[PDB]
């Protein structure tokens, strides 16, 4: 039902 | 308006991704401060697409979050990055 | 180690706030990239304090999020800001 | 059970 996500600004 | 939408990572219907970009455009036209921009976007997605959304707006950040399937988008609009996701 | 912890806004037990600062110190000692720092912190709070945590690490961002009572902290450690909160 | 919070970097 869920996922984990990583984000990083340029 | 003038700002370039660049979607970086999305787990979200294309209709909703377009909404996200629309919301953030309205937010940027209305507000200059990142927390206010994030609040506008969060509140409108809570209304339009059900609670509970979370929004981060900035030029420098990394994140690690857990979202519900099909309810995640990370994108640039102009020089600002926007993380918007549903959890809870 | 060398970094100054400045807690800005917290809805969290002081024990857990100290844990947060400890975790972020370990993260900064281990990792240089903000997403990796955020991941370390998120994963360790998911383990230590139950899922589901979310962590943002950066020098420039505003946010608007919804958290569970007593499970929110926003703080600086050195020049980096850390938002860490539980929702879901 | 929940609250909303705003944060902004200096």
From Swiss-Prot, chains A, D:
Source species, domain of life: Eukaryota
Subcellular location: Nucleus
SUBUNIT field: May be a homo- or heterodimer.
General function of this protein: Has a role in localizing bicoid mRNA at the anterior margin of the oocyte during oogenesis, and a poorly characterized role in nuclear divisions in early embryogenesis.
The protein, known as: Protein swallow
Source species of the chain: Drosophila melanogaster (Fruit fly)
UniProtKB/Swiss-Prot annotation, chains B, C:
Protein name: Dynein light chain 1, cytoplasmic
One example GO MF annotation: protein homodimerization activity
Job description of the protein: Acts as a non-catalytic accessory component of a dynein complex.
Annotated keywords: Cytoplasm, Cytoskeleton, Dynein, Microtubule, Motor protein, Transport
Gene3D superfamilies for this protein: Protein Inhibitor Of Neuronal Nitric Oxide Synthase (3.30.740.10)
GO biological process: actin filament bundle assembly; chaeta development; chaeta morphogenesis; establishment of mitotic spindle orientation; imaginal disc-derived wing morphogenesis; microtubule anchoring at centrosome; oogenesis; positive regulation of neuron remodeling
PROSITE patterns: DYNEIN_LIGHT_1
Record's keyword annotation contains GTP-binding: no
A GO CC annotation given for this chain: protein-containing complex
Family according to the record: Belongs to the dynein light chain family.
Pfam families for the chain: Dynein_light (PF01221)
Compartment(s): Cytoplasm, Cytoskeleton
Quaternary structure and interacting proteins, as annotated: Interacts with spn-F. Forms ternary complexes with spn-F and IKKepsilon.
InterPro entries attached to this UniProt entry: DLC_sf, Dynein_light_1/2_CS, Dynein_light_chain_typ-1/2
Phenotype reported upon loss of the gene: Flies exhibit defects in bristle and wing development.
Tissue specificity statement from the Swiss-Prot or TrEMBL entry: Ubiquitous.
């Amino acid at each position: 039902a869920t996922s984990a996500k990583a984000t990083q600004t340029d | 308006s003038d700002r370039k939408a660049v979607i970086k990572n999305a787990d979200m219907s294309e209709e909703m991704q377009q909404d996200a970009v629309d919301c953030a455009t309205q937010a940027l036209e209305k507000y200059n401060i990142e927390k206010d921009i994030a609040a506008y976007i969060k509140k409108e997605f809570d209304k339009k697409y059900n609670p509970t959304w979370h929004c981060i707006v900035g030029r420098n950040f990394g994140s690690y979050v857990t979202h519900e399937t099909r309810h995640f988008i990370y994108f640039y609009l102009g020089q600002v990055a926007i993380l918007l996701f549903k959890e809870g």
